[PDB]
Amino acid sequence: NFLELAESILEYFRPYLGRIEIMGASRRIERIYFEISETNRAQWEMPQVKESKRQFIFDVVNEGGEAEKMELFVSFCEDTIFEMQIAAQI
Amino acid sequence: NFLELAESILEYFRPYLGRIEIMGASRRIERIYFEISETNRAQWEMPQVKESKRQFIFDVVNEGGEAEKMELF
Amino acid sequence: GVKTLRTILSSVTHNGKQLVMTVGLLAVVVYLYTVVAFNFFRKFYNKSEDEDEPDMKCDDMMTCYLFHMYVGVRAGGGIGDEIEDPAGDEYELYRVVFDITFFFFVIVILLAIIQGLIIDAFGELRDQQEQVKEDMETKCFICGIGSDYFDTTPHGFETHTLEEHNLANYMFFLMYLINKDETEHTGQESYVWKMYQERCWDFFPAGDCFRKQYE
Amino acid sequence: EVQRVKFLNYLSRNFYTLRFLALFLAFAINFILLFYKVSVYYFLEESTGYMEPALWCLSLLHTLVAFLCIIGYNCLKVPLVIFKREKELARKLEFDGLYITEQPGDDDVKGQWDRLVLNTPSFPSNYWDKFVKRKVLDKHGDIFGRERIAELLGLTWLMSIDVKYQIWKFGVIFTDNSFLYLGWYMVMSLLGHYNNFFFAAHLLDIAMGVKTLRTILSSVTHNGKQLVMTVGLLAVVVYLYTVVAFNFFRKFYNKSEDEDEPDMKCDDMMTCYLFHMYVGVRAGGGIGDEIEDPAGDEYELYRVVFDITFFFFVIVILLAIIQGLIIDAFGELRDQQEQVKEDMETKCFICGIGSDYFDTTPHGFETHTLEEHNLANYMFFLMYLINKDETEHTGQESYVWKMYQERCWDFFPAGDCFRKQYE
Ligand SMILES: [Zn+2]
Ligand SMILES: [Zn+2]
């Protein structure tokens, strides 16, 4: 109910509240809720970045798909972070 | 804790301690721990032998893959 | 430039190694045929226009082998089309066998093995752009749990993407962790940062998702 | 004398390099060879005059290396080949026991040569179990004439070697679809001296030299049984066309250059059929391209159908069904190397349990390889066992050895892994 009266708040922040899941200290699954910069939410959904992601998923699924998956994935996130920093320069 | 203190032992023998699994006398799964000859860990990991396994796995997965699998292996 | 061509040419290039080596196989075989031709049928290798003229007759081996790599590989109709047809010679029969064996072992097989290596190639890329979409729609990506567990609720797997993980979300989260000062972390945040620095990456879910945990 | 048992090992040690070294020479010599000209067989000797004599040592050098490799091959793969043929037999006498019961039958005499060797005293020389032959009589022969079975069994260093084991092994080595090649390889190198032109055939080693080409033949060869018969379909079909052309259109089969000349007109059938096997299968443009076009003859309308049907039913279909069967063929191996990797990454290999059970822990299935099995580990274990003296075994180690001798092989896990057991 309370959430039901809260709706005008949540509708604004679903776009840019951030879920994830992590296997945390507890050795179960804490989930967390990071804030997201709006510029990022926009930045990850239009340009080279999208297809960059596609190249990523192709590169992982088709190849290296063992324990390396998370590794390579973080390499992607990091590269992509770097790219967005470069966008920030512009 | 005790295992934690012995690490410099185990780090040396993981390379060549040998696990396997067998369906033993108990008719469950005893697992055993054979010692590995040191030449063998390398001998199986470089030459014709490495590709030789690949010739094997193709010989089994693609063909004869019934009870023969352990037989042939 | 244009994306489609990148795909089309990619289709060739991913097998390009194999394909070039096939071209090597072409050259060699036709060389074997230039040897056999040099040792026997050089009579027939008149370049005469039409006859009783001092045509060089490719009896210099380099020119003979060039005579098969050119206007032999090019044949279509075989090597025999490009050289005067034997008739009544005792060597004629051995020769026509030569021409057929060359026509199969080169232009019917080998150009077909270029063609088919290209076709299999194109086929391969289609097969991989198949499976890539096929795995992300089945297995999650991060959890690995697969699009079947998540069928218990409506379009559940889709939710397991968009909300339970997406994939981006871990990205923005990593961005968050980067931009935050070390004091600013909540415990999960410091933890994730910690593993991220020690780079074990166990923290990303692995088959435990969240939904499977709990009930 | 002693170094022979050293250099021999030196020879075996380099054998893979040794052939690539040889094929490097088969290019090197034969590359010079393309300089020949008739004048006779003149050597062009372009630029340097010392190039031909440089080739002469090479023709000696190559055949020597060609002979040289097999001797290490004789000390490499050959004993591995002779091994498994013993083991293929050595178990077979002690289980199926066929010589004691069956016989192999008229075909696969490779198994029927075995009737010879088994009589030999020195038979199980390579299986590391000399007492097999003793072990067998303990079985089987008690059922009947235990020494009725015995009749089936039982510097002088040159004198020291046996006979029947040797005659048999030499032949088994001959049965090999590799030794026979290198033996075929050296022989042409032996012919490389009688003429350097036959020396050229050594290039074919490239076909099984570099790995990719091996696939490129494998791209074809397994379907070759299915393919060659298409050529059988080809000749036969065109033969039907020669029967038709012979009976009708032989008028048109002028070989005339251009006309009103005594061209033979391929009306002998043997050439009439050859005429379609050649410059017919070769057509490209069909048979009609290679014969003067009909125009206004009453047979023409009946003839032009003969061409189009011959054009579809041979060059459009049948070459395609050679074109295409090669494509599928090449397309097949990709599908199998798919599934091969696909099954070892899903199902285990030993347990059978599959890469999904093991998802309960991180990269678990990967662990199920590396630690829970890793395939190989059973090998090292089986090596561990063979090296042990029988007293030395722990109970599993005996139990494993026991089943290994009775060869039921139930002990390797089968769907029970370890992880599924317990919790
Ligand atoms: Zn997930
Ligand atoms: Zn297993």
UniProtKB/Swiss-Prot annotation, chain B:
**Which sequence ranges form a coiled-coil region, renumbered to this chain?**
none
| The record's account of how the chain is modified after translation | The N-terminus is blocked.
User: What positions does the entry give for ATP binding?
Assistant: K50, E51, S52, K53, R54
Q: In which tissues is it expressed?
A: Detected in skeletal muscle (at protein level). Fast- or slow-twitch skeletal muscle.
Localization in the cell: Sarcoplasmic reticulum membrane
Function recorded in the entry:
Cytosolic calcium-activated calcium channel that mediates the release of Ca(2+) from the sarcoplasmic reticulum into the cytosol and thereby plays a key role in triggering muscle contraction following depolarization of T-tubules. Repeated very high-level exercise increases the open probability of the channel and leads to Ca(2+) leaking into the cytoplasm. Can also mediate the release of Ca(2+) from intracellular stores in neurons, and may thereby promote prolonged Ca(2+) signaling in the brain. Required for normal embryonic development of muscle fibers and skeletal muscle.
| Quaternary organization | Homotetramer. Can also form heterotetramers with RYR2. Identified in a complex composed of RYR1, PDE4D, PKA, FKBP1A and protein phosphatase 1 (PP1). Repeated very high-level exercise decreases interaction with PDE4D and protein phosphatase 1 (PP1). Interacts with CALM; CALM with bound calcium inhibits the RYR1 channel activity. Interacts with S100A1. Interacts with FKBP1A; this stabilizes the closed conformation of the channel. Interacts with CACNA1S; interaction with CACNA1S is important for activation of the RYR1 channel. Interacts with CACNB1.
What the record says about its domains? The calcium release channel activity resides in the C-terminal region while the remaining part of the protein constitutes the 'foot' structure spanning the junctional gap between the sarcoplasmic reticulum (SR) and the T-tubule. Pore opening is mediated via the cytoplasmic calcium-binding domains that mediate a small rotation of the channel-forming transmembrane regions that then leads to channel opening.
Q: Which family does it belong to?
A: Belongs to the ryanodine receptor (TC 1.A.3.1) family. RYR1 subfamily.
Note, other: Binding of [3H]ryanodine indicates that the heterozygous channel is activated by Ca(2+) concentrations 4-fold lower than normal. Single-cell analysis of cotransfected cells shows a significantly increased resting cytoplasmic Ca(2+) level and a significantly reduced luminal Ca(2+) level.
Name of protein: Ryanodine receptor 1
What gene makes this protein? RYR1
Of the intact sequence, the residues represented are 4162 to 4234 of 5037
From Swiss-Prot, chain D:
The UniProt record gives the binding positions of ATP as: M344, E345, T346, K347, C348, F349, T369, L370, E371, E372, H373, N374, L375
- Tissue localization of expression: Detected in skeletal muscle (at protein level). Fast- or slow-twitch skeletal muscle.
Enumerate the Cytoplasmic topological stretches. 74-169, 211-225, 331-423
Q: Which residues carry this modification: Phosphoserine?
A: S256
Q: Which residues carry this modification: Phosphotyrosine?
A: Y253
Segment forming the signal sequence: none
| Residues annotated for Ca(2+) binding in this entry | T391
Q: Where is this motif: Selectivity filter?
A: 284-290
* Intramembrane positions: 270-289
Query: Where does it reside?
Result: Sarcoplasmic reticulum membrane
Q: How is it modified after translation?
A: The N-terminus is blocked. Channel activity is modulated by phosphorylation.
Consequence of substituting I287T: Loss of channel activation by halothane and caffeine due to Ca(2+) store depletion, probably due to constant Ca(2+) leakage through the mutant channel
Give the top-rank taxon of the lineage listed in the UniProt record for this protein.
Eukaryota
What are the TM regions of this chain, as residue ranges?
A: 15-35, 53-73, 170-192, 194-210, 226-246, 310-330
Which residues does caffeine bind?
W128
Q: Which residues lie on this side of the membrane: Lumenal?
A: 193, 247-269, 290-309
Q: What does this protein do?
A: Cytosolic calcium-activated calcium channel that mediates the release of Ca(2+) from the sarcoplasmic reticulum into the cytosol and thereby plays a key role in triggering muscle contraction following depolarization of T-tubules. Repeated very high-level exercise increases the open probability of the channel and leads to Ca(2+) leaking into the cytoplasm. Can also mediate the release of Ca(2+) from intracellular stores in neurons, and may thereby promote prolonged Ca(2+) signaling in the brain. Required for normal embryonic development of muscle fibers and skeletal muscle.
By sequence similarity, the record places it as follows: Belongs to the ryanodine receptor (TC 1.A.3.1) family. RYR1 subfamily.
Other known facts = Binding of [3H]ryanodine indicates that the heterozygous channel is activated by Ca(2+) concentrations 4-fold lower than normal. Single-cell analysis of cotransfected cells shows a significantly increased resting cytoplasmic Ca(2+) level and a significantly reduced luminal Ca(2+) level.
The record's note on quaternary structure and interaction partners says: Homotetramer. Can also form heterotetramers with RYR2. Identified in a complex composed of RYR1, PDE4D, PKA, FKBP1A and protein phosphatase 1 (PP1). Repeated very high-level exercise decreases interaction with PDE4D and protein phosphatase 1 (PP1). Interacts with CALM; CALM with bound calcium inhibits the RYR1 channel activity. Interacts with S100A1. Interacts with FKBP1A; this stabilizes the closed conformation of the channel. Interacts with CACNA1S; interaction with CACNA1S is important for activation of the RYR1 channel. Interacts with CACNB1.
Any notes on this protein's domains?
The calcium release channel activity resides in the C-terminal region while the remaining part of the protein constitutes the 'foot' structure spanning the junctional gap between the sarcoplasmic reticulum (SR) and the T-tubule. Pore opening is mediated via the cytoplasmic calcium-binding domains that mediate a small rotation of the channel-forming transmembrane regions that then leads to channel opening.
The protein in question is named: Ryanodine receptor 1
Task: State the organism of origin.
Answer: Oryctolagus cuniculus
- Originating gene: RYR1
